[PDB]
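Cross-posting from the chemistry board since nobody answered there.

I work mostly on the small-molecule side, so proteins are not my area. We synthesized adenosine monophosphate and want a rough idea of how it might sit in this target. Sequence and SMILES are below. Is it possible to get a predicted 3D structure of the two together?
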Amino acid sequence: RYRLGRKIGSGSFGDIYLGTDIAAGEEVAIKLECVKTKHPQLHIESKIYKMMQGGVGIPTIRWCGAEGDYNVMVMELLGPSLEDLFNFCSRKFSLKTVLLLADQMISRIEYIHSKNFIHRDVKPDNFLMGLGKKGNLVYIIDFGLAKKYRDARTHQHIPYRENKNLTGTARYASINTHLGIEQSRRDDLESLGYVLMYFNLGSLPWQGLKAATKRQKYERISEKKMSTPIEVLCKGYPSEFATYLNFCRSLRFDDKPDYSYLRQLFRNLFHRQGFSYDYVFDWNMLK
Ligand SMILES: Nc1ncnc2c1ncn2[C@@H]1O[C@H](COP(=O)(O)O)[C@@H](O)[C@H]1O
């Protein structure tokens, strides 16, 4: 039912192609999982996307099972990542673009939380703009590290746990993630806070820090992050950014975040600046 076109991306558990859904007559993205291992990841990712179906800015998927030496997931075809678009804008976004993005990104994370998952990989690479009719819509992708933080029926929160190892990308990790604490809803939002200040600054002060051979590879990132006050990180930017990060850092392990407070904080700033909620992003002005 599918025709595979040109490769458009590579991921930790396989590659993303342009494809045709022959029955639907629509162009789609097709994720192929080649190396299964004993614990293949694509079928699990598809099951999390199924529980997120009906979410705005969550790609619609079709689990297709095996073909030859591949597992197949057909996805809504999306546009450039926010990391790609940041590079295209010379690694500066206007305050207006950062606030337009913040408004959607809080809502996307809230939606995932509402379906009893935490994302745990919040970074600009994993937010993609839509194409065509959905060009103004921020999507979130990559549920490869996503976890249930509560039972689907009980809403009994996962237990507190420490002594965990940090794996993958630390640039946007929460301070508690550096400290080996179990991730929960607060950590996704603290990560988003570092993403927003990254868009403001062009980089983060701990970005690209390398440890000595033999040392834990993240120790220089962790030390800089913990020794950089929020007020120093956010110096020269509207107070709302510091307010956002202080609020996230204050949340207890099992606390339900006040998403509406964080959105309204940025909305009030948007109004004080006299910005129009027009979805005219910096990249729309590129010539
Ligand atoms: N549905 C999609 N539409 C377009 N590009 C995608 C899609 N999913 C993933 N990508 C791209 O594929 C690469 C790896 O994505 P992933 O490994 O699935 O997180 C990155 O360059 C993403 O921007």
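Reply from a structural biologist on the board:
Welcome over. Reading the output above for you: The chain has nine helices and nine strands. Residues 8-9, 11, 16, 29, 31, 59, 75-78, 81, 128, 141-142 surround adenosine monophosphate (CB under 6 Å). Happy to explain the token format if needed.
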